[PDB]
Write a structure and sequence with these properties.
Belongs to the glycosyl hydrolase 1 family. The chain is an alpha/beta fold. It contains 16 helices and 13 strands. The protein has helices spanning 17-20, 33-40, 57-71, 82-85, 96-111, 127-130, 140-155, 168-171, 191-218, 238-260, 268-280, 293-299, 327-331, 354-367, 388-406, 452-463; strands at residues 10-14, 75-79, 115-121, 161-166, 221-227, 230-233, 305-309, 313-317, 334-336, 372-376, 412-418, 437-439, 448-450. It binds 4-nitrophenyl beta-D-glucopyranoside.
């Protein structure tokens, strides 16, 4: 039983628009911040790669559905490109080609018995909105509501699972370095917090919009996807345990405390540590923005489920490091990884499957056991179809999740493997492979070929159990 999926549990796979679509300027699509980064700053990206073509899923979406059907996916999580739909960012112009494209994908999925799950924002902000300052500018919350309205209006009759944002903890970091994630702005400890504040407001506006204008007719669910790693105490001391709690609150709690708790607002430790550090450095005002009481009440409770992106673990010890100012320095934890942990093709990604069970329990206890949908979990290598490391990664993480469900009572309701195909991997270009299907980026037809992990995942999805050969 601990190896069997609950009957209603949803299994599938996931992708993101800029990572797969290509067709970056085709049929009316406007430019986004990743078009800008890869065109203007190829020195930031491995091999100077771009997402101009990527997997060419704009043209090859029927092939993507074919492989999802082969895999036996029940749900396909994909994201919508904001600038493909609203090329100017604002809602004055709706690109019919964009509407037709996503309807064509949704309809193809449904005709093949696969449920669509749509992420509204996976990092590809229209450049016209970045030119106003992007996420640090609170005006983007209303622009995000207007974008969501166009999505609910056009697609909500058929789409019943929505995520507003994918991993703002990472995308806010685009405002904390001059050479990093788009838009590559160096405002650490200041602009990244402003970006977080806008995203939280935007998410809350989108959820209220669904309640007011769409839920009664459409009957779907709206969540948000938050990335978090497990943080294990470097030693068993109370002080190192405190540092791990700081990590959880500064990385997951930053977004989840305002939305998923009864109290709302940012975590106290976040408010308090940033206030103290700002005062010690001579600022008149805290670097952390504030919510009014009315805003706290508006934002809290804006969820039907919690999306979790989980990849790895860290060790945390008591102390402070990082540059002043920065979110890492403010967080009051020294983070490392254990050299014993198995490695991947990504410097930051170590294989620590027991950390997934620990994290699921931390979430259960902090947020009163919300329904959790694992929206990303996966592994990198440099290439190859006989992807034993990826197979092991998936089987171990699924086993740990199933223990969380069955033994620990955690309400996990679905899981989409990251990712369906090898991707444009952001600053890593085409150098790192996260797919369960390989794609030949040198072949204009971009054929998709199953790896061993795709065959194992199909076996899991078909049998609804972890096969005996992978059990302890
Ligand atoms: O803190 N971490 O461990 C972490 C943060 C952000 C992450 O981001 C993920 O990274 C994947 C692999 O590159 C991308 O394909 C995917 O688009 C992205 O959501 C993944 C992991």
């Amino acid at each position: 039983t601990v190896y069997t999926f609950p009957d209603e549990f949803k299994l599938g796979a996931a992708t993101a628009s800029y990572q797969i679509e290509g067709a970056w300027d085709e049929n009316g699509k406007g430019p986004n911040i990743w078009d800008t980064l890869t065109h203007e700053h190829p020195d930031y990206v491995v091999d100077g790669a771009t997402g101009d073509i990527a997997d060419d899923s704009y043209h090859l979406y029927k092939e993507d559905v074919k492989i999802l059907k082969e895999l036996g996916a029940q749900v396909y999580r994909f994201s919508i490109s904001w600038a493909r739909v609203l090329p100017e960012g604002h809602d004055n112009i709706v690109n019919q080609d964009g509407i037709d494209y996503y309807n064509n994908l949704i309809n193809e999925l449904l005709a093949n018995g696969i449920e669509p799950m749509v992420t509204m924002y996976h990092w590809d902000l229209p450049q016209a909105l970045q030119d106003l300052g992007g996420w640090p500018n609170l005006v983007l919350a209303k622009y995000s509501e207007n974008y969501a309205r166009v999505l609910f209006k056009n697609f909500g009759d058929r789409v019943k699972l929505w995520l507003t944002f994918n991993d703002p903890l990472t995308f806010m970091d685009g405002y904390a370095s001059e050479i990093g994630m788009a838009p590559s702005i160096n405002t650490p400890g200041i602009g990244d917090y402003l970006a977080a504040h806008t995203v939280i407001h935007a998410h809350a506006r989108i959820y209220h919009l669904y309640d007011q204008e769409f839920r009664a007719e459409q009957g779907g669910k709206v969540g948000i996807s938050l990335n978090i790693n497990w943080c294990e105490p470097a030693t068993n001391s109370a002080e190192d345990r405190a540092s791990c709690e700081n990590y959880q609150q500064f990385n997951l709690g930053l977004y989840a405390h305002p939305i998923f708790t009864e109290e709302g607002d940012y975590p106290a430790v976040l408010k308090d540590r940033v206030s103290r550090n700002s005062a010690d450095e001579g600022y008149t005002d805290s670097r952390l923005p504030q919510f009014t009481a009315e805003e706290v009440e508006y934002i809290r409770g804006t969820h039907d489920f919690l999306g979790i992106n989980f990849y790895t673990a860290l060790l945390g010890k008591s102390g402070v490091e990082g540059y002043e100012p920065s979110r890492y320095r403010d967080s009051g934890v020294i983070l490392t990884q254990d050299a014993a942990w198995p490695i991947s093709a990504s410097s930051w990604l170590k294989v620590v499957p027991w950390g997934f069970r620990k994290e699921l329990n931390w979430i259960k206890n902090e947020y009163n056991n919300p329904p959790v949908f694992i929206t990303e979990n996966g592994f990198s290598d440099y290439g190859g179809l006989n992807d034993t490391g990826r197979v092991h990664y998936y089987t171990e993480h699924l086993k740990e999740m199933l223990k969380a469900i069955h033994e620990d009572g955690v309400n996990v309701i679905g899981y989409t493997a990251w990712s369906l195909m090898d991707n444009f991997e952001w600053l890593r270009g085409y150098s790192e492979k996260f797919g369960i299907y390989a794609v030949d980026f040198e072949d204009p037809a971009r054929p998709r070929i199953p790896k061993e992990s795709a065959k194992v995942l199909a076996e899991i999805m078909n049998t609804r159990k972890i096969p005996e050969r992978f059990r302890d």
